[PDB]
Design an enzyme around this catalytic site. Structure first.
Site: not given
Ligand SMILES: [O-]S([O-])([O-])O[C@H](CO)[C@H](O)C[Se@+]1C[C@@H](O)[C@H](O)[C@H]1CO
Ligand SMILES: *[C@H]1O[C@H](CO)[C@@H](O)[C@H](O)[C@H]1NC(C)=O
Ligand SMILES: [Zn+2]
Length: 1014
Positions: A60, A441, A62, A174, A311
């Site tokens: 993950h 997000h 971000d 997420d 993550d």
């Protein structure tokens, strides 16, 4: 066309109905804290019926959160991708899925050609698989569907061009709660499957017990089911390894091999992972297979999905080795031990779905149908994530402004093919990518660290400047005689004038049109209308003299109104909030009339004295202890008075009454009709002194809101023939009600200042008998029925208000439309409320590591529509959807896609034309050309232009239809040689159209067309 109003879809699970039935009890279910002890029959699986297990490695990433996009890329992501390339290349059986294309594109363009080739090969052979393929994994609550489509298209266009692949499976692990707007867009973009994760723990429990975690998700109004998209909901609390191998995190944690020590991670359940060996593999396998079999009980087929990641995982080579080697040992043992009746292997997301459907096709399972959404999410107890529907409201409003500028820039420049020297494609690509990135997000959600929010804002600012450059060069070419047009691609022919962003009181950024007998007598201004229908709207500009008249390019006088430029000030000396009038600049206002997807030119001319077609507004300052308010040359003296109730009426519009505090009290629709009680009120929510604290994500109020103490606020009344308004300086908010003849526009200049642990809410109180029902929209695409549930805490009854909300009874409806996504609810019959800003001192334990103390002034805008609906054909009581009226819809369009305004920058515009697009078809009001984008560069022999057409559904209330021409986007540009219907991303041709005619779409439908030109 399906009827989206009168036929209630029959589905197995309807989320509003399920919510009404569910108890939401939060009991300790054991090791699976929010479920129960899963039991299975060991005989279920055997030699002729094995459990096929797919372990899917993932990471993950971000695109900004606690580090900026670039910081994460430099410190983590480029290493993850570099090592994934090496490790997959060298271990043919290893697999990996990737979601965030913004990061992949950033990486790929930095690779040497040898590595680019190795990367393409591991994608081509199925080892590295893209899931969703959007620029980001967007927020699903605050995002507008148009930007969700934009970022999906940005990532997928890149994937098609450079990797030659288009994902058909989506991965969304997420976003904080999920929207049906995703399968809507995805199913129309070639998708066959999707996966979601953050849904309320009670919903997970309920669907798991019924084995309804996999379902065909259709739209709430879809009776036939053609919008259906197969969806897999993960069952547990997190997407991390401890919550993905099965129900017991204490056991699953032992199979995240990065938690043994050297990596600085450990298992909080106190049992660490142990290296798999020949002497412990049987016992480790027995534990693991047991978790797998329990997870398998919650689903219908013999194909099991086991995500393996967290993550920014798979960063170090030693990490790749430790996860891969240990799992290879487990697989070799499990697959050769007949008694487990399991076949496990590394797999990709598409592999999982392909096997599931093969099982389905073999008659192994039938899946339930479902409609509804998954808001508002709670990951545990009463920790509902409704705070982020409002966090960092300045950037949430900025999102909508950029959304519109991107559409206008792409549309205005689409009309022509541009030389590469104009850098049109370059500027548009940058603008699309920065707006796309912000859909993340942790972007528009306002859940990132302060310096990351700043990074997103700077990016969006550059995107706005890019749109402006493109828009102004386009206007100049569109309105200048061809044989005279002489562009300097770096020159600013026009300056955009935006009266609502950043907004008066936020930034003094608007330029004043300076006229004067000794310097410049007049100035050309141009309005653009991105909507596909003729449109009139008042526009205003700042001018250096109040004696200005307006004419169109045929020199016909245009009625205008001049008002003062008023700015509000927190006077630290008198300790009051009051307005000061400019003595050097004034506002001129007039009605612009602009062609569908067109432009209209006007001229502002100064004169010695009051021009014949310009009127002047009167102004009245209501407050005790007034002082003079001079206005330079303005011809009407400001009047004063003690605070008192007042009433106003512009044109034939409604008559509005205000309290002596300057807040709406009632609306009278017609001269005869009654004064309907509609009261605005501002309140504040606090934070709990004991227990969980509200933060960027969580809204944990310390009870119902308390009214803001208003004191005796200063109220300014401006009364004009074209526009009147009432403005009041309240603590933290300059509240304004503007009237132009129809539903009023409301603007709030919100400055929460240093009011710590406070959330400011704007509430409407009426006598409408709505009971416990209200409607809110999902991504500006559809309105869904909400039911306030007293069995849930206050924060759970808050929902995303991305663009609108309403309440109604049998006769009356009140609709509040927004120019920015914010959180809101209806906590009592007759009420509507929406949060303005929130300032929180503490972190809410979801990883952000800080509170929200970076608030800044923001100008929120709205339209408030009170209407009689007793004659409207509405859905029945059991229908889960609601629909706007024509006036409410138009009002929303006035906030999101207003006319754009351009001021000619030089003294004289030679070759100027008065209009563009007068021959464009004026489409029916429920139809919009959401996107107009030229898809080819100028060197392409066959030019291609893409259009996204969306038709909403408006209630029939007795107003005769009339006129309107058919809109055929394929014939908007000349020399059409082909017209094709395509997926929404324009990447796949779905239909060759006869006569090269693009037919219009059905209500609530969205289609894409590409026209090709010789
Ligand atoms: O460990 S942590 O505090 O970073 O947070 C965890 C795992 O517990 C999250 O799943 C990180 Se998720 C990463 C980010 O996009 C979301 O805002 C986060 C919301 O909580
Ligand atoms: C990849 O896309 C298709 C699908 O397999 C393949 O046939 C083709 O060779 C590749 N496309 C290009 C232009 O290389
Ligand atoms: Zn995330």
């Amino acid at each position: 066309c399906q009827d989206v109003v009168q036929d209630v879809p029959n589905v197995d699970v309807q989320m509003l109905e399920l919510y009404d039935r569910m108890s939401f009890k939060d009991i300790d279910g054991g090791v699976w804290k929010q479920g129960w002890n899963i039991k299975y029959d060991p005989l279920k699986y055997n030699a002729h019926h094995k459990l096929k297990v797919f372990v899917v490695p993932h990471s993950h990433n971000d695109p900004g959160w606690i580090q900026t996009f670039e910081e994460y890329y430099q410190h983590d992501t480029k290493h993850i991708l570099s090592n994934a390339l090496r490790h997959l290349h060298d271990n043919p059986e290893m697999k990996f899925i990737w979601a965030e294309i913004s990061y992949f594109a950033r990486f790929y363009h930095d690779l040497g050609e040898n590595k680019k080739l190795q990367m393409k090969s591991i994608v081509k052979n199925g080892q590295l698989e893209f899931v969703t393929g959007g620029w980001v994994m967007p927020d699903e609550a605050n995002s507008h569907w148009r930007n969700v489509l934009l970022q999906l298209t940005e990532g997928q266009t890149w994937l098609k061009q450079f990797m030659n692949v288009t994902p058909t499976a989506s991965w969304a692990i997420d976003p904080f709660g999920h929207s049906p707007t995703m399968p809507y867009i995805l199913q129309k973009s070639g998708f066959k499957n999707m996966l979601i994760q953050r849904t309320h723990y009670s919903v997970k429990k309920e669907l798991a017990q019924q084995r309804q975690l996999e379902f065909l998700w259709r739209q709430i109004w879809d009776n036939k089911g053609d919008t259906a998209l197969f969806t897999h909901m993960m069952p547990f609390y997190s997407y991390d390894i401890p919550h993905t191998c099965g129900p017991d995190p204490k056991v699953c944690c032992q199979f995240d091999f990065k938690r043994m020590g050297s990596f600085g991670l450990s298992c909080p359940w106190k049992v660490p992972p142990r290296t798999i060996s020949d002497q412990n593999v049987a016992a480790r396998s027995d534990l693991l297979v047991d978790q797998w079999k329990k997870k398998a009980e919650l689903y219908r087929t013999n194909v099991l999905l086991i995500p393996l990641g967290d993550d920014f995982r798979f960063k170090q080579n030693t990490e790749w080795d430790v996860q891969r080697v240990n799992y290879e040992r487990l697989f070799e043992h499990i697959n050769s031990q007949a008694h487990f009746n399991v076949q496990a292997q590394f797999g990709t997301l598409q592999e999982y779905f392909d096997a599931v459907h093969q099982a389905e096709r073999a008659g192994q399972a039938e899946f339930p149908t479902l409609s509804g959404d998954f808001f508002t999410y709670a990951d545990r107890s009463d920790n509902y994530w409704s705070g982020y529907y409002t966090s960092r409201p300045y950037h949430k409003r900025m999102d909508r402004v950029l959304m519109h500028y991107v559409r206008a820039a792409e549309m205005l420049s689409a009309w022509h093919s541009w030389d590469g020297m104009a850098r049109i494609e370059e500027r548009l690509e940058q603008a699309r990518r920065e707006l796309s990135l912000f859909q993340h997000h942790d972007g528009i959600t306002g859940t990132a660290k302060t310096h990351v929010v700043v990074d997103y804002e700077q990016r969006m600012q550059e995107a706005l400047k890019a749109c402006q450059m493109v828009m102004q060069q386009s206007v100049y070419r569109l309105l200048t005689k061809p044989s005279i047009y002489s562009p300097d691609f770096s020159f600013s022919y026009f300056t955009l004038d935006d009266s609502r962003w950043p907004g008066s009181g936020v930034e003094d950024s608007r330029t004043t049109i300076i006229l004067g007998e000794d310097i410049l007598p007049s100035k050309h201004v141009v309005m653009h209308n991105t909507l596909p229908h003729w449109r009139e709207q008042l526009v205003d500009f700042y001018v250096s003299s109040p004696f200005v008249s307006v004419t169109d390019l045929a020199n016909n006088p245009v009625e205008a109104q001049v008002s003062p430029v008023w700015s509000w000030h927190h006077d630290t000396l008198t300790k009051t909030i009051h307005p000061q009038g400019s003595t050097t600049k004034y506002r001129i206002i007039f009605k612009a009339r602009v062609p569908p997807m067109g432009l209209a030119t006007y001229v502002l001319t100064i004169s010695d004295s009051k021009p014949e077609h310009t009127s002047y507004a009167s102004n009245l300052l209501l407050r005790k202890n007034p002082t003079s308010l001079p206005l330079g040359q303005y011809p009407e003296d400001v009047k004063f008075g003690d605070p008192r109730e007042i009433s106003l009426r512009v044109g034939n519009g409604p008559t509005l009454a205000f309290s002596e505090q300057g807040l709406l009290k009632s609306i009278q629709l017609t001269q005869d009709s009654p004064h309907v009680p509609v009261h605005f009120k501002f309140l504040k929510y606090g934070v709990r002194s004991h227990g969980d604290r509200s933060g960027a994500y969580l809204f944990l109020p310390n009870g119902p809101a308390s009214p803001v103490e208003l004191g005796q606020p200063v109220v300014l009344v401006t009364k004009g023939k074209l526009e009147s308004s009432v403005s009041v300086g309240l603590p933290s908010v300059v509240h304004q009600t503007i009237m132009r003849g129809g539903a009023p526009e409301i603007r709030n200049l919100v400055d929460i200042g240093s009011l710590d642990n406070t959330e400011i809410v704007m509430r409407l109180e009426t006598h409408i008998d709505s009971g416990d029902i209200f409607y809110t929209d999902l991504n500006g695409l559809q309105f869904i029925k909400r039911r306030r549930l007293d069995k849930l805490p206050l924060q759970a009854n808050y929902y995303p208000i991305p663009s609108g909300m309403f309440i109604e009874d049998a006769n009356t409806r009140l609709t509040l439309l927004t120019g920015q996504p914010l959180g809101g609810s209806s906590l009592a019959s007759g009420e509507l409320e929406i949060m303005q800003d929130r300032r929180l001192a503490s972190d809410d334990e979801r990883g952000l590591g800080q509170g929200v103390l970076d608030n800044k002034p923001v100008l929120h805008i709205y339209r408030l529509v009170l209407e009689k609906v007793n004659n409207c054909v509405r859905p029945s009581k059991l229908h889960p959807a609601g629909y706007l009226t024509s006036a409410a819809h138009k009002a929303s369009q006035s906030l999101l896609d207003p006319l754009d305004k351009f001021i000619f920058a030089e003294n004289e515009w030679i070759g100027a034309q008065g209009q563009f697009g007068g021959d464009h078809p004026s489409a029916r009001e429920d139809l919009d050309v959401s996107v107009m984008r030229r898809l080819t560069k100028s060197s392409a022999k066959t030019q291609r232009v893409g259009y996204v057409l969306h038709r909403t559904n408006l209630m029939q209330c007795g107003t005769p239809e009339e006129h309107t021409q058919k809109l055929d986007v394929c014939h908007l540009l000349p020399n059409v040689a082909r017209c094709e219907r395509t997926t929404l991303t324009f990447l796949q041709n779905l239909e060759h159209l006869d006569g090269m005619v693009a037919p219009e779409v059905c209500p609530m439908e969205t289609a894409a067309y590409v026209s090709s030109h010789s």
